[PDB]
Subunit: 172 residues, 2 copies
C-alpha cells in the first residue's frame, strides 16, 4: 500500500493533462503539493533572464524557506528600483516573508536596501561595481538550482504501463 505518494503521482498527471482546476482543489484538500519544476534549466533561465514575476510565483509555489530566498528577493528589489518600480520595490520590502525575515536577522543589510530604494536615482555603476548584474543573477540561480528537484514526466502513466506489462507476463 502506498501513501501520499499516490497523490503527487496524480498531481503530476493533472498538470500534464491541463486539468489545472482539479489540480488546484486537490493540493488544497489534501495538504500535499508538487515540489517539482519542469526543468532546472528553465527555472534558472527565468532568474538569468530577469523574469522576476515568474520566479517569485515559482519559488512561493514550491514553498522554499525564506532564508534561502533572502538573496533572491533582495536582488529583485534592486532591479525593481533600477526599473524605478518603487511602489513594487517597497511592496516586496514590506510584505514578503524573506524580507520580513531579513529585517529581523540583519537589520543593517535591510537598511541599506531601504536607502537604495529611496535614492533620487539609481546608479548601476555604484551598485553593480563590486559585482555585476549578470554575476549576481548567475550566483542566485546557481545556489537555487540545488534547492529545486525535477521529476521524470508522466510517472503515473509509466507505472500503469508497468502494471500492464506485469499482467501480460502474469497471464502466462
Amino acid at each position: 500500500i502506498e501513501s501520499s505518494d499516490v497523490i503527487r503521482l496524480i498531481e503530476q498527471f493533472l498538470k500534464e493533462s491541463n486539468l489545472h482546476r482539479t489540480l488546484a482543489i486537490l493540493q488544497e484538500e489534501t495538504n500535499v503539493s508538487l515540489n517539482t519544476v519542469d526543468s532546472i534549466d528553465g527555472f534558472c533561465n527565468e532568474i538569468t533572464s530577469g523574469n522576476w514575476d515568474n520566479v517569485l510565483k515559482t519559488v512561493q509555489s514550491l514553498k522554499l524557506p525564506a532564508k534561502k530566498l533572502i538573496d533572491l528577493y533582495e536582488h529583485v528589489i534592486i532591479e525593481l528600483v533600477e526599473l524605478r518600480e518603487l511602489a513594487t520595490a517597497r511592496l516586496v520590502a514590506r510584505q514578503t516573508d524573506p524580507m520580513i525575515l531579513l529585517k529581523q536577522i540583519d537589520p543593517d543589510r535591510f537598511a541599506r536596501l531601504e536607502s537604495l530604494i529611496n535614492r533620487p536615482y539609481f546608479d548601476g555603476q555604484e551598485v553593480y561595481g563590486d559585482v555585476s548584474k549578470e554575476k549576481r543573477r548567475s550566483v542566485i540561480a546557481q545556489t537555487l538550482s540545488s534547492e529545486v528537484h525535477v521529476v521524470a514526466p508522466s510517472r503515473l502513466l509509466s507505472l500503469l504501463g508497468q502494471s500492464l506489462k506485469w499482467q501480460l507476463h502474469q497471464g502466462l
Copy 2:
C-alpha cells in the same frame, strides 16, 4: 482527454479517499463519471426497498438501454398508481424514454398500463395477486443486477502494486 479509464481510476481513488471536493471538480472539468456501482447489494436493496428516485438516478448514470428499463419504469408506474399518484403516473408513462419505447414496441402492454392508470381505484388483488409486490421488485433487481458490472475497490492502488511487482522483476537491474 485521451485517458478516460485513467480518470475513472483516479475518480474511484478520490471517492475512497474522501476527496469529494476534488472528485466533483474532476468530473466537471473532464466531463466523465463512474459507470460502475460499489456493490450489487446497495443497488439491489434500493430496488427492493422501493427507493425509485435513487434507482432511476443510478440507472441513468449507467446509461442502460431503454429496453432493460421498460420493466423497471412500468413497475414504478404501478407503484405510483398504487399510491393513487395518477398525475405523476401519466407523466412518467408519456414523457420518459422507456415508456415511449414501450408504446411503439408493445402498444397492447402499454394500453394495459394506461387502463390501469385511468381506473377509478387500484385493485391490489388483481395486480399483486398473480405476482406479489415484493416478488416483482426482486425480479427487476435480479435482472438489473446482472446488467451492471462491479469493479474491485482501490483499482489504482492494485495496479500500482503490480507496477512495483514488475519493478522487482525487471526494475532492479
